[PDB]
Symmetry: C3
Subunit: 366 residues, 3 copies
């Protein structure tokens, strides 16, 4: 039983793959928190003039840009559409679509992303895989399984024939720097379903779904406002939490959350169906906590601010708040709350009215 | 191979939790019939003035009320809309939604429900598990796994900050009588997707799909006549059969079935793909018979009347009756039926016309 | 990991079942190619006056007709609708629907087909299994499990009562020549969702998708063209390639393919996520090669013509062409092609335009 977890730990990457102008970090997909969740996380950072070479995957992928500005281009089945991006942006990558990424400024692009290996679209097995169009490099997840591109595996005679070019150029196509190359002079490529928009900024926005000036803000990107996400059946949440503010106990009725802290630190508590407090610790920058589906999560911030991206596995996730304005205890008859918690008619009124805030709750004022 | 079943058996519960104002019985989900079916069956019984404390699961539940009257409430993501139930009601509970159940009559409410652990909505694993909003009590299925509520696992200052209450009522709220709890005086709460009907009656009271004055009647609730079921991707079927009558051999094209014998006793026969009669015997009251996807069933009523609830795992189950007005042999040309059964034309007609009834056949007439 | 394929081999059946008027051959569903793919291939040939007795499976089935003409009737939940078929007809058989087939010419019908055991519609297990309506004989896939039909498993009094006939025509119904019997005189039943067409032609008698008078043609049947396929979540592709012409390196973004060679031979090459060439060999008639989801495939015909059928597990498969008019590299900016392959502007142009052809490229001409 994958999801029968006794103790969640804040996970770190166990794989660093330094390339010419970048780095690839990957988290072990065979640790039970990731086996339960069904995703595979990764963190690609691309330095100035770096170009992530073309690659595709056997599952939906959703990329969050932690920092940097670049151009990302998809090759959906001169040249196709190139999309500009910024920090805060959420990029949708439908199953098997090949894409590439380039950074041009000093400030390295750091993009953290998830491959939902447990998707219905993933017709292979639960192993994450990346198929690169070029270069002779071992793909990020090869270590977990246990190199070349998909093009280098072909015989020269076949490439010569398919491309209709001579043996000499066929040799370069056949392999012969890792995934993230550095462009010497830099690309001079123009700065701006085939219609589908796959870029929706949830980080550096000014339209919070929930906004509390004394507690923080929380933005979400569901398929409602970011419709390419229905193709992925994936979601993402960006939250900024002030010091000692909190996000009330809650649960995702229909989704698995992968909380990746972008900044600061926060003390978190997740409890299960048995009431066991499976994680009672702190989650820091660049670390990850996986909250399984109906497990309840609570967080109190320790920084100004605690920012995070929670990749949920459902394009329309539904959260059930256990405390605050729209809670599950609030929608209860004042009498049943009395008999399930063993309370007085006066106490039940406090549990149902004392916190007027939705989702985010302000510091206690100590 | 989980559904490669040798011999089935009319199963009775293995677990029992006597609660202050009621009881809970659960069938072992780790039995091959149940692993094959991909469901977790249990039967709660609410005594007079009992309340069932709010809980929720990672899967589409479908409750059936064997007997009783009362009011049930669902806390979707003063208070929310309560619905009144009577026996023969089918309640649809979406994945993850919390619900509470209350009985006021002397008569105990009996409800048999399944949890489709093999749902698409179930992102965890094949374990059944309930998430109780309150109390200190071990969840029904913990047994199978091998405490408290989700609230009793949290910290006092987390709970105080969350609910914005004093440490005295937060400590109550923190779990400090099992799942079912008697309301001493009794609730004063009335007896009359937010607007979606999630209760339908398939009791004898309801107009049946099939009615034969000498055989019985069959009423089934699908997503066409009960639309909320297209959310649970589940459905149910009530059936009453006069003594010695029988429902013809038939198979569900697209759904596993979980026959719960409510009243009386019967003599069922289910045969598989290899022609092996994997069950020949009797399914009596309070017992369960699992009949997989294309396995053919036939039952002779040994009582006036044998009554059942068949939980199908599909919102629009399609059945393929082998003998009847509607049957497969009937749609077969007389000549091709001659040749598959080594028969004369005139005998072939007997097979396509002797029995003129749909699904139900009157007693043999002896 | 089921799809961690080391080496693929051009598979062939390991099970011959000679019947009275025909034959049934099947491929082992437990090899890693088929476990990875998630299907069950089979090839039934019926000779003159042969009838394939009524049956059904617990999954989506897609039947392609290699050769011959006959009729096939469906018995969807006098008689039902019978369709005539010819070579190149792709019959969509929705989950659990019972059907029978008949042939009346000297030329045997050779119908190769697939049962997708990894379907959402399949609620049993991954073991393929056919349920026969009549006759004592063992089911094609019983060999893989480790008989008689579903009717010959009931107690003689149950059939008697059910069909409302006597002990004698009840024995003839209760079993007392295999699945494909010979209809001595001949089935005189006239040669012509209820109305949803489940026969569509893709063979050499069609108006092709891709056509090149020097390379061949490719005709694809998706749910766009044949709407009954969206029920199956399956597709097929018929291709005819002239000697030495080739279909460029390409991958299916969302499907597994089961390439069954109809006529001739071809030198096929498929490579994986690690640039390993998992298959470098010849695929000839009656043999089959499984190209898992994002694996790249390229073939070069060694015959006039190499004809194949490609069962893809997705009703709307999207392919990524790596070389050709509409290829992935064709859409890449000349400058990123220069930097990902280590080429110059001019060479980059040669890879984008030397092959002016979509998917099929002609002989090299030497």
């Amino acid at each position: 039983n994958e999801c029968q977890i006794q103790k969640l730990n804040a996970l770190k990457p166990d794989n660093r793959i330094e390339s010419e102008g970048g780095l690839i970090e990957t988290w072990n997909p065979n640790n039970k928190p990731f086996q339960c969740a069904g995703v595979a996380l990764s963190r690609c950072t691309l330095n100035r003039n770096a170009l992530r070479r073309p690659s595709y995957t056997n599952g939906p992928q959703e990329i969050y840009i932690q920092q940097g500005k670049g151009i990302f281009g998809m090759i959906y089945p001169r040249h196709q559409k190139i999309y500009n991006f910024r920090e805060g942006d959420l990029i949708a990558v439908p199953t098997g679509v090949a894409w590439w990424m380039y950074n041009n400024e000093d400030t390295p692009v750091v993009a953290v992303s998830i491959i939902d290996t447990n998707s219905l679209e993933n017709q292979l097995d639960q192993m994450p895989r990346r198929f690169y169009l070029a270069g002779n490099q071992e793909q990020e997840f090869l270590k977990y399984q246990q190199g070349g591109s998909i093009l280098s595996g072909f015989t020269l005679e076949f490439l010569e024939h398919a491309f209709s070019v001579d043996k000499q150029i066929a040799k370069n196509l056949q392999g012969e720097k890792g995934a993230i190359v550095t462009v010497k002079g830099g690309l001079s490529v123009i700065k701006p379903i085939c219609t589908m928009r796959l870029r929706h900024n949830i980080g550096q926005t000014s339209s919070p779904d929930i906004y509390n000036p004394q507690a923080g803000s929380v933005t979400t990107a569901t398929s409602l406002d970011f419709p390419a996400l229905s193709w992925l059946r994936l979601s993402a949440e960006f939250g900024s939490l002030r010091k000692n503010a909190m996000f009330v106990p809650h649960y995702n009725l229909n989704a698995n959350s992968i909380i990746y802290a972008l900044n600061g630190r926060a003390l978190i508590q997740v409890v299960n169906c048995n009431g066991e407090r499976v994680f009672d610790g702190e989650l820091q920058e660049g670390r990850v906590l996986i909250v399984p589906q109906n497990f309840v999560v609570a967080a109190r911030s320790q920084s100004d601010n605690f920012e995070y991206v929670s990749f949920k596995t459902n394009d329309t996730p539904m959260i059930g708040t256990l405390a605050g304005a729209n809670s599950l205890l609030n929608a209860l008859p004042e009498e049943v709350i009395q008999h399930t918690f063993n309370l007085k008619s006066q106490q039940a009124r406090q549990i149902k009215n004392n916190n007027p805030f939705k989702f985010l709750v302000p510091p206690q004022e100590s």
